Design a protein around this nucleic acid. Sequence first.
RNA 1: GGAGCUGUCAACCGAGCGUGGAUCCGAGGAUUUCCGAAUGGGGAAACCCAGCACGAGUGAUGUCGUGCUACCCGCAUCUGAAUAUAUAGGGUGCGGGAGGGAACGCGGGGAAGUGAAACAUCUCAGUACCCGUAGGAGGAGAAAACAAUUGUGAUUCCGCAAGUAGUGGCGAGCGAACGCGGAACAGGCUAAACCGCACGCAUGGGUAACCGGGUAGGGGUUGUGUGUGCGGGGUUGUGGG
RNA 2: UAGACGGUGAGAGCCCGGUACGCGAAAACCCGGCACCUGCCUAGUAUCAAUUCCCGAGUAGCAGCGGGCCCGUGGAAUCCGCUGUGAAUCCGCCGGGACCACCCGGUAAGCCUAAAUACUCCUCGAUGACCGAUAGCGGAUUAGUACCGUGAGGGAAUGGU
RNA 3: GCGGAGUGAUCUACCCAUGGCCAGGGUGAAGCGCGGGUAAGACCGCGUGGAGGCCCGAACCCACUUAGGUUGAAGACUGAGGGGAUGAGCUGUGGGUAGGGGUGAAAGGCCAAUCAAACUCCGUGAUAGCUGGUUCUCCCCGAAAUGCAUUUAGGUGCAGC
RNA 4: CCGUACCCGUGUGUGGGCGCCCGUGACGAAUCAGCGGUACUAACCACCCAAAACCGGAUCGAUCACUCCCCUUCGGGGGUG
RNA 5: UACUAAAAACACAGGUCCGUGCGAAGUCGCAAGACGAUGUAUACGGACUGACGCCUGCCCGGUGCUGGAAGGUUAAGAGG
RNA 6: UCGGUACGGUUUGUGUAGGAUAGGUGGGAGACUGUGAAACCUCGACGCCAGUUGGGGCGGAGUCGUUGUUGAAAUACCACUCUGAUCGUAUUGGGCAUCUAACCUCGAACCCUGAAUCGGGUUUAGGGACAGUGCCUGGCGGGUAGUUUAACUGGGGCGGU
RNA 7: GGAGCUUGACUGCGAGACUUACAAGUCAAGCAGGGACGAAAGUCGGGAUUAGUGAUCCGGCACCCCCGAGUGGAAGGGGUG
Lengths: 47, 63
Amino acid sequence: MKLILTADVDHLGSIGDTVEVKDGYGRNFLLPRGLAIVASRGAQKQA
Amino acid sequence: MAAVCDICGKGPGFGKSVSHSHRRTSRRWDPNIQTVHAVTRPGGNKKRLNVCTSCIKAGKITR
RNA sequence: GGAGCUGUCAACCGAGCGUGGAUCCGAGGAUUUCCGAAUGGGGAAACCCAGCACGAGUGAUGUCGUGCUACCCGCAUCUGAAUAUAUAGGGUGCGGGAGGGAACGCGGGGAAGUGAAACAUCUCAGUACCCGUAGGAGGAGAAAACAAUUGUGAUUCCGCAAGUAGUGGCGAGCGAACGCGGAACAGGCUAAACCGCACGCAUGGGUAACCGGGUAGGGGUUGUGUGUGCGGGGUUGUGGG
RNA sequence: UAGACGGUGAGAGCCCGGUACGCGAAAACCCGGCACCUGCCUAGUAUCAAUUCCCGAGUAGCAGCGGGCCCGUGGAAUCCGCUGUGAAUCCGCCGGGACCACCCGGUAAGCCUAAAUACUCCUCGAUGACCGAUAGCGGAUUAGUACCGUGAGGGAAUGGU
RNA sequence: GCGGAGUGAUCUACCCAUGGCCAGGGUGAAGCGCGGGUAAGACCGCGUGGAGGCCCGAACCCACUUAGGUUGAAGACUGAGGGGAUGAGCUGUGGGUAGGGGUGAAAGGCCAAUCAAACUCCGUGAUAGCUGGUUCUCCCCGAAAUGCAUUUAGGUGCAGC
RNA sequence: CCGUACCCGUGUGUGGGCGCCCGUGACGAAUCAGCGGUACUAACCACCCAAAACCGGAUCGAUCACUCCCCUUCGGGGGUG
RNA sequence: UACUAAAAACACAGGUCCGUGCGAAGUCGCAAGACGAUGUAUACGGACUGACGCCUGCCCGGUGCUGGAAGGUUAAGAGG
RNA sequence: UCGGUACGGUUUGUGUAGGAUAGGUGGGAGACUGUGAAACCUCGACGCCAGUUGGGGCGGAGUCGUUGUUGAAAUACCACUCUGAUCGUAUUGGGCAUCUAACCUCGAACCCUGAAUCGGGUUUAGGGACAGUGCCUGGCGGGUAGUUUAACUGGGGCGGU
RNA sequence: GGAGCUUGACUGCGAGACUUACAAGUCAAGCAGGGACGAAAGUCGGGAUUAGUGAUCCGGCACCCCCGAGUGGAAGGGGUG
């Protein structure tokens, strides 16, 4: 699943390349950091 | 826990534990309840939710 | 309505009323202590003891009469901590529920004795019982339905299908629907799409390609998306928007 | 239109209350009757290639364990639960008893929806090849009484000048 | 007897909180001082002391023998002798623990006069191959107690009669 | 009830004392120049805590090739190294 | 052992053994939560024994319980 | 790290055929002149100065089919070599880890609780991907639960049938 | 007792009777197929006879256009052994 970063991280990468999260490592780590989104209407606001 | 999920309205499930000789006695199936900490938004106080796992992944999502 | 009446066991003494309409009968109102969900707090239910506010009373407290004061959830409003955001909570003001009733309903839990000539699967039985929850009925209900070629066309209910097919330590037993005959017969609203306003993040820090729509100007202008809030739109299987 | 029934000193259509039938009402509740208030549409319905989007998501599916169904997991579909994994939007999914191909039926993961159905605490009306005081309600008689038990509970008897 | 739901710690078992009570004598521990003994202290003799799950023995608590009671005065008692009696004592009040559970200095004892699972209402009119009972008359006919099988031998199915 | 009391509160009058109040007294707070206790801390260290790759000092079996000799039943036993 | 048994039974103080390192182990509930204990290995739980004196001989095979990786077997899962 | 599997590459055994000992090979009988240079000490997964395949470089113009006297050997062009060592783009079971951000804390402080050793929130310290818990699961389990534990018979039992 | 050659240690059957509580058991002339032995007649559907075995339900292994849950299949069932 691709998603929409805010800061460059050694797993996720840039903002908008190809996201390969580990299934929980996002909402327990990333989404508290305010650096990642579970994509709902984000594949075009990313643009 | 053996609990019941909050948002999902999920709850236990009864039935039977049928051993080989078919002696069926009552065991209960439980939802997979974890005590997550659910901020309203970034900055809330994340109280506590005995919520299932089918409502950690998708459905309600905070942590 | 019309001549008595003063409920009765239980008929005794009183002392009264009634033809100006009594007792009596119907409907509506007022009063409706105390307990009881009982709810100001407490309590061996039917009692103990209060707060505030009116309103009496005494020379003055004590006393008395009336009203509210429980809790919870929902909402409106100020509020908002540790900590700033901000919630958690915290006052305020209206709205609600609570508890019962013989059964009938739906959802969940759910025995045992018994039968099986023992017994464990199975039965008994989804029974008794237990919990949740409403109703004048409930539930179900409008095809992701059966049917198998002629198909029917929501659900529910009654008679058959049928003790049938089946299913059963194929034991004791359990047992449909297809389908017909009938009671009755009712279908609808939504979300999703998109179009429209609004807030808040992104976007423009504007040249934005868009200003009800067509050409030429035209202020250079907020064109353009997002997290929702609301208004239309849409409701279908001969597929439909 | 009255010979229902019951009473009166016996067995009453004609003595009485009544019945048959007819009147019957303020107010209440309720049936319902008309006007007011509110609720729409200021055509895209048609036909059109089909350029595109949508048609209910941790849901359906699949695997694990159970429930339920005539179906005792058997080979079982359909449906329901809990756990993993986990979809599409019509050239999609679903069903047609494993499953597969063709052929049919329908479009689940929103909700709502009267009737016929059962029910009896309650009031009215009625009846009985129902009982008639050891019966019939436990209860005709102060009845859930007296008494019994700490309590939950049990629980009578008792009619006739 | 089995299950569901309750009711019971007013008796009894244990515990918790707070109170009460135990005549009368006797024995004389630790300790302290004295005469000391002993380089010292151990020990003796003194006085004082007042200790004990100490002694005897009233209340109070139990209940050992025995006679009496035995359709008792009493559903567990009475008379005489008994054990305990400052304690692991008795007792009061109030409270707590509950049925496959409580509590138990343990006996399977007590849990409201019947506890190897209380009591009550319900399933329920449980169920028994076992026992008892089954009510009026006559007329005709009229057996069997054997075979086989059996978780069967006091039942039953079939046959025989 | 009699006699004599005690307690909790209330009303009216009287004495003086106190003190709010103008009137005296106990003191005591402000920013500014000086300086201190060193409390406190952008570096580091006195002491000592503790542990690192990496060189490693004793531990040994139920570990793998050595076989240095044992009986074998195709299988094992001592001991540095 | 109310209500036929008061005893050689039960308890005991003493002795070991086993467990428990601390929201203990054990126990009551499903859980929270309790007691254990506002205790803490000289403490708490369990089992046997039963003041004191002399002592408590032999056996690790059976079964517990205790610590041990050559392994074999090994069920849902992975897998194909 | 053990080690994996798809793979984008340098590309593997002194057994016979010996300049020459390349799982199979092969659109072809060099990828035209168009290759990692037969010059030196050459010493590597083979190490056997022999190597068709060869490690640090060559008289900056030639290991050639068709100078093969061998399976046609000139296959770093078709098999982009089995591709042994793997050279790194992925996946990714285990082995061991360090970390914190889920989660767990009767460890700490504060806040509405000051009416509080329950709660809840915040920072804090510690664990920490563990336990716990859910679904699946092997074992074990008189700890509880339902039940079985036959008959014959010269009473029953023991014996036997 | 021996010697030869062989598989009838058969497929479809069966009038009839023995016995039988029922279930089960036993014999069976003869009929046809296709065989053995015999020159033929004939005998052979196990052993001189009577024991050497177990019902049912349920699974298994093969042959058969028997059925096949919309139809073609199929799984599953079914008959035979």
